[PDB]
Amino acid sequence: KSSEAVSQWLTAFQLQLYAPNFISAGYDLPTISRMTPEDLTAIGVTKPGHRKKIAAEISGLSIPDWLPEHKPANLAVWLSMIGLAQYYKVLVDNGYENIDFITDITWEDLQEIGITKLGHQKKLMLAVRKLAELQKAEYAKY
Ligand SMILES: [K+]
């Protein structure tokens, strides 16, 4: 249903030819909505004209909040909440079994352990920043 929704979003403004680009990188509309243009380049959308239509349509997206507004009890809950539970084992087996360890993580670290799909990295990285923001929100108090 996710890839379905990406296809449809792109066919709606005639750029479905890039569906493979987004989909095979594991992008989903939520994650797409937070793409920088650098991200766009990375998945092969390089033609300025198409970049710009997509960039405009990206800002045009209005889709419900999906990042957890609270730090969850454990890695399983968290991965589940952001729809990347298939990485539970690889993360745990590579020493990222608790949330705190993730918050330090970078894309280089994800590449090391095999989580390479750029869309998944983006989503994973977006989720990590939100935790980082939620932490600092405590120290302002404490
Ligand atoms: K699963």
Q: What Å resolution does this PDB entry report?
A: 3.1
CB atoms closer than 10 angstroms to residue 134: 15
DSSP assignment, residue 95? T
Q: How far is the CA of 76 from the centre of ligand 1 (A)?
A: 10
71-79 long-range contacts (CB < 8 A, ≥24 apart) are: 71/99, 71/131, 71/134, 71/135, 72/99, 74/98, 74/99, 75/99, 75/102, 78/102, 78/127
d(CA 132, CA 1): 30
CATH of domain 67-142: 1.10.150.50
Distance 49 CA to ligand 1 centre (A): 37
**What is the C-alpha end-to-end distance of the chain, expressed in Å?**
43
Return the structure tokens found at 22. Answer: 């987004």
Q: Confirm if 75 and 96 have CB atoms less than 8 A apart.
A: yes
Whole-number Å distance between alpha carbons of 55 and 132: 27
Equal fold, 1-66 vs 67-142: yes
Local structure of 117: helix, strand or coil: coil
Give residue 72 CA to ligand 1 midpoint distance, Å.
18
Q: Residue 59, CB half-sphere, CA atoms under 13 Å: how many?
A: 7
Approach to solving: X-ray
Alpha carbon of 84 to ligand 1 centroid (Å)? 7
Instruction: Write out 14-70 in H/E/C secondary structure.
Output: CCHHHHHHHHHCCCCHHHHCCCCHHHHHHCCCCCHHHHHHHHHHHHHCCCCCCCCCC
**Domain segments of the chain: what residues?**
1-66, 67-142
Q: Is 106 exposed, middle or buried (0-12, 13-18, 19+ CB in 10 A)?
A: exposed
| Residues by chain with Cβ below 5 Å of ion ligand 1 | 85-86
Dist. CA 45–CA 141, nearest whole Å:
43
CATH superfamily of this structure's domain 1-66: Transcription Factor, Ets-1 (1.10.150.50)
**CA-based R_g, the chain, Å:** 16
